[PDB]
Amino acid sequence: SVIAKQMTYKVYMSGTVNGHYFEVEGDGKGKPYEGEQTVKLTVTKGGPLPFAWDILSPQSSIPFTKYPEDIPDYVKQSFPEGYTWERIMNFEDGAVCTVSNDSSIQGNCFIYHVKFSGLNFPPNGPVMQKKTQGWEPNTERLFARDGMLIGNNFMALKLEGGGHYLCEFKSTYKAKKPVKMPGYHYVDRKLDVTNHNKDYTSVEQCEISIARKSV
Amino acid sequence: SVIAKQMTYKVYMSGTVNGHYFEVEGDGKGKPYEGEQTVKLTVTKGGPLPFAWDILSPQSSIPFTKYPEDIPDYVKQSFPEGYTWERIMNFEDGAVCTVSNDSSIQGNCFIYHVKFSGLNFPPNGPVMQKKTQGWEPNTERLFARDGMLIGNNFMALKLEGGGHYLCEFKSTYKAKKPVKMPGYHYVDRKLDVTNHNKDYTSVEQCEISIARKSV
Ligand SMILES: [Cl-]
Ligand SMILES: [Cl-]
Ligand SMILES: [Cl-]
Ligand SMILES: [Cl-]
Ligand SMILES: [Cl-]
Ligand SMILES: [Cl-]
């Protein structure tokens, strides 16, 4: 396979949030067959960001998902040709983000190019006031349709003071060549910001992702 | 506690689907602390139903959910006063259902009164053409807000021929008196039609529901 037991990745992300332009670059590493990975991000343009970092954390790596042998692994099969993904994030206060990725491979390093567009975040809401405290551990429902893998997730951000701020994800993963399609299944994830500087111009994230066929 | 290790229930359900009125009565039993239950339904008015039975199967019992000791059990705590629930089902082809319940207790028997309103099912879609083949095993995301328990579930019906027909649930459970609120958690369920007659005027269902605090 072109996917080694230890791999690196490079992320080039750019976008807007309520009209504010930014660029981010990241250096990641992980164990694709263990579903373990980490990434170090730097804001390279438009920093310090005037919005919560948490809306960007799920946008910087599906090859690093642990798949049991009896569940086809859509994204690993897509390489070396690679894949793209598209995502809609619908927040409960009306904000909407559209995110797209292109993923390729060069040797032992995946290359991700990400475009992020977020808007209608209320100026006094938790994203513009930076009151979020990370995503709850979560489960993505996945199934195959028309050669694409479609995921849906009822996500939530923890808030300063104890509440939750809800977000619905719809993710569409598109392999660049046909692959063996999986059945109806789930992916459980833990995604955490494990380090950052005062203004989130440098951020470190760790993610564990494990696929399964229902409890 | 007023909830015994073995209990029964009676269901009185009525409603409309694309303007077609019906009534259903059910007799259920289960082990509330094991999350195990079964129910036998009879269509008492408006039968045979011109729509897929599956849209009604999740509307006939939250007391029968296995809760670990370290997760407060919102619905069991609500008794003997009881609780109500409200549900919105949004199907991917535009159909929408609104469902409400009132649940009370009389001795060893819970009493459920259910009102179902479903509409905009396309006449050539899988519900009106009876092409559904049961719900996939699923996971409800649950959290506490304003004294209510709010659940969300990315559900799917299996289809004749191999596809899936998606439905999003939003359920709101409302205890009639204040109870100890749980943290952010999940409930996994298997719900199956285990017997039926030719025209689904008699149906038997079995459900296993188990709460947990993330994999
Ligand atoms: Cl790692
Ligand atoms: Cl497919
Ligand atoms: Cl850092
Ligand atoms: Cl039982
Ligand atoms: Cl609350
Ligand atoms: Cl039967």
Residue numbers in the entry:
A (entry chain A), B (entry chain A): 2 to 61, 65 to 219
Publication passage describing the model:
Anthozoan chromoproteins are highly pigmented, diversely coloured and readily produced in recombinant expression systems. Here, high-resolution X-ray crystal structures of four open-source chromoproteins, gfasPurple, amilCP, spisPink and eforRed, are presented. Like GFP, chromoprotein monomers have a β-barrel structure that contains a chromophore, which is autocatalytically constructed from adjacent X–tyrosine–glycine residues encoded within the protein sequence itself.
GfasPurple has only one molecule in the asymmetric unit, but its crystallographic symmetry expansion also revealed a similar tetrameric arrangement of monomers. Previous work has confirmed that S175T and S61C mutations alone are sufficient to shift the colour of gfasPurple to be the same as that of amilCP. Like other characterized chromoproteins, gfasPurple, amilCP and eforRed contain an sp 2-hybridized N-acylimine in the peptide bond preceding the chromophore, while spisPink is unusual and demonstrates a true sp 3-hybridized trans-peptide bond at this position. It was found that point mutations at the chromophore-binding site in gfasPurple that substitute similar amino acids to those in amilCP and spisPink generate similar colours. We found that coloured variants with mutations of residues that face into the β-barrel were much rarer than those on the protein surface, and all but two of these mutated residues (Tyr116 and Ser761) do not interact directly with the chromophore. The Y116H and S61I mutations obtained also changed the colour of gfasPurple to pink and indigo-purple, respectively. Sanger sequencing revealed that one of them was the single Y116H mutant and the other contained Y116H and E73D, confirming that the Y116H substitution is responsible for this colour change. Interestingly, the corresponding position to Tyr116 in gfasPurple is His120 in spisPink, suggesting that chromophore interactions by histidine in this position may be important for pink pigmentation. Finally, we also made single amino-acid substitutions to disrupt salt-bridge formation (E96D, R149H and R149K), anion–π interactions (E140D) and hydrophobic interactions (F158V) at the a/c interface, with the intent to minimize changes to the surface character. These five mutants also produced colourless colonies.
